[PDB]
Amino acid sequence: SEARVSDKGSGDSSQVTQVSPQRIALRLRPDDSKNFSIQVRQVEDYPVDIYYLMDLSYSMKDDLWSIQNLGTKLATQMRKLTSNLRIGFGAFVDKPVSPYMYISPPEALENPCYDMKTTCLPMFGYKHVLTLTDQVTRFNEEVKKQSVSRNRDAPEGGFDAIMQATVCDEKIGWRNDASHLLVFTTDAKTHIALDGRLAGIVQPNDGQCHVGSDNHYSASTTMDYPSLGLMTEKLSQKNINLIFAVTENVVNLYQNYSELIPGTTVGVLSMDSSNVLQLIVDAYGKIRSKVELEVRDLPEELSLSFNATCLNNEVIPGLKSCMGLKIGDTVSFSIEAKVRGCPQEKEKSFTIKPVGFKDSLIVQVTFD
Amino acid sequence: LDVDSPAEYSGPEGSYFGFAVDFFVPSASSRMFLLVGAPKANTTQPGIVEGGQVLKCDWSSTRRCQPIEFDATGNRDYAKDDPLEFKSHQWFGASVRSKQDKILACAPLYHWRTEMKQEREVGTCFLQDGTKTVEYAPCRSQDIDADGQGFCQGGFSIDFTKADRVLLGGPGSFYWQGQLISDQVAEIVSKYDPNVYSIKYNNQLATRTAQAIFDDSYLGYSVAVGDFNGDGIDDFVSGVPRAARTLMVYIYDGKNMSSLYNFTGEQMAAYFGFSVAATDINGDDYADVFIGAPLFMDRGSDGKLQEVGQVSVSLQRASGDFQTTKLNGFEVFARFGSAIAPLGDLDQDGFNDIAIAAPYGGEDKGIVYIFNGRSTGLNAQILEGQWAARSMPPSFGYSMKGATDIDKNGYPDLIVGAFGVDRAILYRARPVITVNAGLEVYPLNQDNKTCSLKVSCFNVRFCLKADGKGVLPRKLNFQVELLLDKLKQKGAIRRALFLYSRSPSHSKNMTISRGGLMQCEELIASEFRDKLTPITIFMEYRLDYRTAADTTGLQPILNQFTPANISRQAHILLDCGEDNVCKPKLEVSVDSDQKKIYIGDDNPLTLIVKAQNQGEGAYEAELIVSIPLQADFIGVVRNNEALARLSCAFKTENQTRQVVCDLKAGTQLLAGLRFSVHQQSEMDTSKFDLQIQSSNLFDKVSPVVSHKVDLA
């Protein structure tokens, strides 16, 4: 009864194997229960999705730079943290309705800054110009080309931008296996779920995407701002890490805002955008992944058993997974086989699939 | 309130019918009108669309809703190529009020060609004075700027003052700070001149501007009136939902416009101040304050935040002795709060009440809660919008008004709007009936045996009365139900019975009239083994609602409190009454007189039985002469030197030998107690005790016995 493994390298960019030697051969007979051990230490970076949200209203007279600077820094900051980064953006000013959108003269519709002897693009719905792409260079180029528009009242409706961002899975992008970060930038006491009465807008915000064929938010003029509890629901449902990245004039209000929506944290926008970069890194330590193995191509025989010699030298029979693995943790799995009966075959093999992992464990048995 | 047979209305598609609701009445006439806004209706008036209407729907016999006296009167012009008003962007019907013969219908999104420039901004209200109709626009008086009353949206919320003043609320009257405007009705109608577009009224009292810290507070978002300092004039309370760092409600004196106490919440973004109601719950004329926080969210049962909403009751008492309490919601995202409708004596049995609604709760459709008021308040009915969504959430309960009676009620009836479905429903309040009742046991045991064939005959009481105030049918057909003995299992038995029928229960039909007169009925209440457990008397009652409704079909209702289901106890002599406290002292002992008996189907082993209890009520005392396995009472003793009729019954359920013998003093009812002891197990050798089963001998401590027999 022989059993001989081959891939002793503990991970590499070229040597992409994240496991021990993963090719094991053995010679056995019926009821020859053999044992061997594998190390599945994970040395791969973590996946992430980041969404950048802006107000970009006339309240941002000269505060638009703070939004533009953070988006670029947030892009390059997490690239260092991880190479699995996907980034994008989407913008929102306020609802296109009577008390905000400057509907009375024919001149204002194309320019609500007409009376101020300056131009501003017509105030719009939630329009995101970029889906999550690995192109970092396209994100900061596109995100810097957008400008501001004007609404009548000081509060802005960037809360609808959060709600649409967290429900439009494919229009702007969401990966199932990655962590999701949503940074929302504003500088005003945003409308909260009931300001649409003054606008004739009396439809509660929904957990549905409404970007539509055009990039503009279709329901921006017929449904209200989202509830603060609704944003709590959709955020945790889709594993969104929200960051109320706001200004110092309203940080205290948004601090007390975060204590009501769990998992949320704030950051004072400025030239030194470190109020949020040291925040997204905090979320990096909370998105630690897990290791789990699977069985495939097994020819209805060759029973397998696993022992969970997982973190901090803890042993528990039967288990086959341990959670909360940072990069570099060496979880081992002592695997024992159990062959039954006599298959009508001489050479057979089958593969063990570490879930989520590129490599796999393959065992070949020559038997009679 | 009544939900089974309400009255419903509808209008043009997408018209937002029911967004605002109130009650029009005629002067000393019964042709009351249920005014209801239709702010998005297409206007059947010249040269204008998107105007909206205020529809008068009658009270009964018809569903017709027709527009106001102001009809077929379109956009007025300013010049040959400029309309005086930018109407077709307005919301006529967003707020409706009526007091005796007046209408205050306002269009917060109305625009008008301004005079200072060519822009468009203001809100307008169209009163009615009998036949004459006038225009009200307090935010149109040369204050044409966003800095002032240009974006006023005046009339968004309005209210009536007992001094015949009208309290108008425009949240945008300032830079969305808001303002209360109060003008006398006589001054408004008298100063009417259509060629003048900014009519000024001399006795106007309005809130002035504040600092830049106050902004977007929406002072005129919700309004109500009451007396909060005690001078006979209605003060102005207002819903400021976004004040004090979006954490408020303002109170202003009626004739001074001075600032009285302000109310603030502790939660954030809850919209504390979406609706405000002014009524009395505690009992003193000092009116209370109610504040709505429809977006309130607190720690839940699982330790996580959940948005359920919350309201605040302010028991404002003189000399600063204020007390406050908070009422929480029940359904997540239901927006409990929202429309707080000050009702009044919805139940006349006490003082006023408050209706709080959840526009987005229930299955799929809107929910309405009811909070009845008692002394000190702190009383922390359900209605659903069974109408299904068409293309919009059916925001049932968003608009509500239940301050005015419309029938022979005294109770105020409730109007509910469902603008998201283009409909409005009338919830007519129901006549409350309070009830009180009781019963007790009069009668000695051995003298009842002479009641007729002879049975036992007792007596109890049969007294119930309802009375109750209000206008409702004088005679009410009550159904009452009583039980002879309760707490019985489905297989348990009865002890006291009605001799005339032997029924263990009886229910009675009575058409009792409304009055203080006391009405009671008359009735008289050795074959049963149960003595110790007390007889339980129970009382149940109900009302044939279907026939008790009036001609209008308004269903009567009994008191929502007063839980009924009441019951009492009783006890009878000769069960254990021979003992004053029925406490027993068992010392139940038996002995194994014979010893050294051979093992295996030999002559039966002889034992002795005696009693030791001295309790006076030693009825039914049990003789469970327990034996080990492989034994039975073979050879029942016939000599019976002192034995009684104790004949045992035997069974071996769950390997437990029954051998149950039965019997008022410790007496040696003794005879040879025999047992087969047919032990077939040769490896065993040789536990005898008397088990307790007599309730009359049962106690928390049972002095028993324990002995064994010697075998060779």
Ligand SMILES: CC(C)(C)c1cc(Br)cc([C@@H](CN(C(=O)CN)C(=O)c2cc(O)cc(Nc3ncc(O)cn3)c2)C(=O)O)c1
């Ligand atoms: C251009 C910018 C960045 C300024 C801007 C962007 C957007 Br989008 C919307 C606005 C509004 C809101 N607003 C502000 O943004 C500034 N707070 C104010 O309205 C404002 C200003 C005050 O200087 C005092 C007060 N308070 C007040 N209100 C009424 C009154 O009779 C007296 N005082 C209120 C506006 O000024 O028209 C401005």
